[PDB]
Amino acid sequence: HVGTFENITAAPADPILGLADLFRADERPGKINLGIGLYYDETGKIPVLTSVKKAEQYLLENETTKLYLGIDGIPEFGRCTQELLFGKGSALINDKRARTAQTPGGSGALRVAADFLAKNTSVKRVWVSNPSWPNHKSVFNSAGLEVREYAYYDAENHTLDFDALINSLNEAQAGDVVLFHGCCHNPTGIDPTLEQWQTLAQLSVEKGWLPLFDFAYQGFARGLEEDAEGLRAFAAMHKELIVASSYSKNFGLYNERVGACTLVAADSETVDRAFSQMKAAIRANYSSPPAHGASVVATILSNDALRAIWEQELTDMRQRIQRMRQLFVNTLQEKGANRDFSFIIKQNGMFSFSGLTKEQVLRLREEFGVYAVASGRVNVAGMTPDNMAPLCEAIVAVL
Amino acid sequence: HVGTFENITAAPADPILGLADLFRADERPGKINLGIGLYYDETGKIPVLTSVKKAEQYLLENETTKLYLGIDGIPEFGRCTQELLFGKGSALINDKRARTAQTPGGSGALRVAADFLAKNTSVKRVWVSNPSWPNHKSVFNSAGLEVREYAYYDAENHTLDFDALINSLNEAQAGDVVLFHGCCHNPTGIDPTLEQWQTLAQLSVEKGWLPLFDFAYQGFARGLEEDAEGLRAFAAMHKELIVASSYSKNFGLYNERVGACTLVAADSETVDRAFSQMKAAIRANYSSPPAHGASVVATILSNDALRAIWEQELTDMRQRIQRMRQLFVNTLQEKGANRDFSFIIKQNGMFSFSGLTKEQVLRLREEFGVYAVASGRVNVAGMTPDNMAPLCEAIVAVL
Ligand SMILES: Cc1ncc(COP(=O)(O)O)c(C=O)c1O
Ligand SMILES: Cc1ncc(COP(=O)(O)O)c(C=O)c1O
C-alpha cells in the first residue's frame, strides 16, 4: 500500500531547543550557552538546590508506595500553590473559588488550560504579547485556538509601550483570552508597574477578557510576594481567571516537570463544575501527573526549616543574576562597546533583549561559539565572572 | 459581563478513578477494593520494588543536575525499551527503523500518538476492541479521531470470539489504525494465541491497516519475551507500526508516569522525518518528560545486577496473581457457588472478567463493601489470603 508515514514533512527546528542541540555538539572548548533559560552558578554548573537534595533524601527513606496520584495531583501541593499565588489570607481561598491541578511543568499547565477552553467553552482567540515565549503559539494552536498578538515592547527606548499595548487590546472582544506574564517577561524582562497592572485589571473587567497568567519566574524579579502583585490585583477584581505556573526554575527542578494550572470562577459551585471538565482533559492526556518533583516542592513548602533554606537559595539566585547584569554592562563599556547598554540594568529575570540583530547573533555562534536566541535574547543567568570577558569581547567584535 | 464558565456541563464520573474516590470515602470496616489495576502483595499493600529503591538511592547520590531532558527523553531509556519490545538482535533495531520517545506513562504515549497522527497523517479512524480500557476512546477523541469498535470477547464460552473479530474488522480501511493489546487484554484477560497473532498480522498487511499496540503489562502473562511474541509477529511483516508501552505496572512506578511511544517506519530516513513531527507534538504538550521515573527504569535495565533482581520481582508478582486466580476459583466453589468460574484460570494478567451484571456489581459495593468496576472487571491482584473468604461470600450472595 501507499504508506502512512511516507509523505510526512520534516519539522522545523525549535528556536530554543534546536539551539541547545547545536551547543551540545559544538566541540570548541570556549563555547558559551546564553540560550535556554537555565540558572548557572558562579562556577558555570547547573546545580541541584540543597533544599531539593534534602527533600529527595526524606522521600527516599519514607516513601512506601508509588500508587497513582489523583488526576489533579497531591492536595498539599495544590494548597501551597494557591497560597504562593494569592496570599495566605486570600478571599479566593476562603470562598473556595479556586481549584488547582498539578501538571507536568508550566508547559503542561498551558496545554491543559488550552484543551480545557477549546473543548468546554466558546473561546476562539488567545491574545499573546509581541514578543513572547516562542512556544506559546504552538501550544494554543495545537489545541485549536487562534492566536493574536498585541504590542508590548518599544524597541527604540527599550521600554514598555503602554499606549500601544492598550490600543492593540481594544481589538480583543469579550470572551477572548489575554495572556499576561506574571513577572520577568520572556524575552524582554520588562514588566508593568503595579499602577499599570491595576489599569489593565480595570480595563480587563470592563472589556470582558478572560485573563490567563503565565507564572514561570515567581521570585526572580523582586520577591515571592512582590512578584505576585500584578496577579493579585487582577484576582481582587475578576470573577474568572486562569493561572499556569511553573516550579522548574525557582526550584531548579527542570526535568522533573513540576507545574500547576489553577482555575478561578465566580463561586465554588461553578469552579467545581468547570474543574470537572479540566480533570477530564487531563485524563485524556497523561491521566495523572508525576509525583517525584511535586512531592519535593510540597515537602519544602510545608516544612518551615526546608522552606527557609529554599527561600535563601532563591534569593541568592535572584541576586547573582542582578550582579551579572551590572557586571555585563560595565564589561561591555570596558571592552570598547560605544552603545549604551544601561537599559539591561532595568530588566528583570533571567533574560534581556540585547538589541543584537539576527545576523549578529549568527556571527556570535559561528565565529565565537557564543549561543544566543536569534531574537537577540540572552540568558544573563548563564554569565559568570569567568566567561564575562570572552563573551563581551565577542559582542563588541560584531557590533 | 456573562461568565465564560457558566455554560459548562459537568463531566461524568470516571468509570475507574471515580470508583477509587468512593472507596476512600466508605466508612464501613472490611471494605475491599478490586477496582483500579494496582498490584498488591500478600499483606494488601502496594509496595515499592527493591530494585526501584536501589536505583533511587543511586540517583540521589550521583545526580548533579536537573537540567531538562531532550524532547524524547533519556537516550538509554529508548534503546532498552526497543530491546524489550523487539528483541536484542531485531532487524528493526539494526536497520534503525525505530525511534522511541519517553512519555508520561502509557497514557501519555497514546495521546502523543493521537496528536501526531491527527496533525501529520490522513488517519481519521481508530479501531478499538469491545470491551477495552475505557480511556482509549477518550484519548483518541481528544485529538478529533473517530473511534469504532470491533468484536472481541465471547461472553458465553469466555474465550476470544475470533470469527466475530475477523468479520467486525471487515470495514477497516487501508490507512485506518487498529489498536491491539500486546498481552493481558484489559478487561477480559483473553489474548490471541501465537497462531491467531500470525493470522492477524497477515490480514493486517493485506488490508493496509496501521497497527498500534498498547503494551501496558509486558511480563504479566507468561514472561517478558513470551508476552511480546504477538508484537514481533507483526513487526516481522509490517513496514509501519506504533507501540505505546508503560512501565507503571511491571516496575510498580505508577505515579512517576514512565512510558514510551515507539515509531516504526519503512527505513531510517522515513522514521527520522516522522519522529521530528512527533517531537513537535510533544513540544506543544508537556515539552519534555519527567526524568525520575525513566531514570530508575534505565538504571535497572542497564545494570546486570539490578535487572536480575527486577526480573525476579516481576516473576514473584506474576506468580502471586496466578495463585490468587486458583484460590479465587476454589473458594467460590467452597462457599457454595453453582456457577462455574473455571474460565478465570485461563485469563492473563491482573484482571478477571467475572461476568457479573452492573446490578450485581452495585449490590456488592453498597451491600458488602466490595468494589469492582461496573463492567464486572475485578482486580485479581487485589485479592489476598485474608480477604478471599469474605470476598467470595459476598459474590455468592449476589449470584
Ligand atoms: C514564559 C514561560 N512560560 C512557560 C515556560 C515553561 O516552563 P516549564 O519548563 O515548567 O514547562 C517557560 C520556560 O520554560 C517560560 O519562560
Ligand atoms: C491497556 C492499558 N493501556 C494504558 C494504561 C495506562 O497506563 P499508565 O499508568 O502508564 O498511563 C493502562 C492502565 O493504566 C492499560 O491497562
Numbering used by the authors:
A (entry chain B), B (entry chain A): -2 to 396
Q: What does the publication say?
A:
E. coli aspartate aminotransferase (AAT) is a pyridoxal phosphate (PLP)-dependent enzyme that catalyses the reversible transamination of l-aspartate with α-ketoglutarate, yielding oxaloacetate and l-glutamate. During its catalytic cycle, AAT undergoes hinge movement to switch between an open conformation, in the ligand-free form, and a closed conformation upon association with substrates or inhibitors. Using our approach, we enrich the less populated but catalytically active closed conformation in order to increase catalytic efficiency (kcat/KM) with the non-native substrate l-phenylalanine, leading to altered substrate selectivity. Steady-state kinetics reveal kcat/KM increases of up to 100-fold towards this aromatic amino acid, resulting in a selectivity switch of up to 1900-fold, and structural analyses by room-temperature X-ray crystallography and multitemperature nuclear magnetic resonance (NMR) spectroscopy confirm that the conformational landscape is remodeled to favor the target state.
To obtain structures in the absence of maleate, we applied a rigorous crystal soaking method to serially dilute and extract the inhibitor from the crystallized enzymes. Overlay of AAT structures (Chain A) in the presence and absence of maleate show transition from open to closed states upon inhibitor binding for WT, VFCS, and AIFS, but not for HEX, VFIT, and VFIY, which already adopt the closed conformation in the absence of bound inhibitor. Superposition of bound and unbound structures for each variant confirmed that closed library mutants VFIT and VFIY remained in the closed conformation in the inhibitor-free form, similar to HEX, while OpenLow variant VFCS and OpenHigh variant AIFS adopted the open conformation, similar to WT. By contrast, the HEX spectrum at 278 K showed a large broad peak centered at around ‒61.6 ppm, with another peak of substantially lower intensity also appearing at a similar shift to that observed in the WT spectrum (‒60.4 ppm). We calculated ΔG at 278 K for HEX to be –1.72 kcal mol–1, a small difference that would be compatible with the interconversion between these two states to be part of the catalytic cycle.
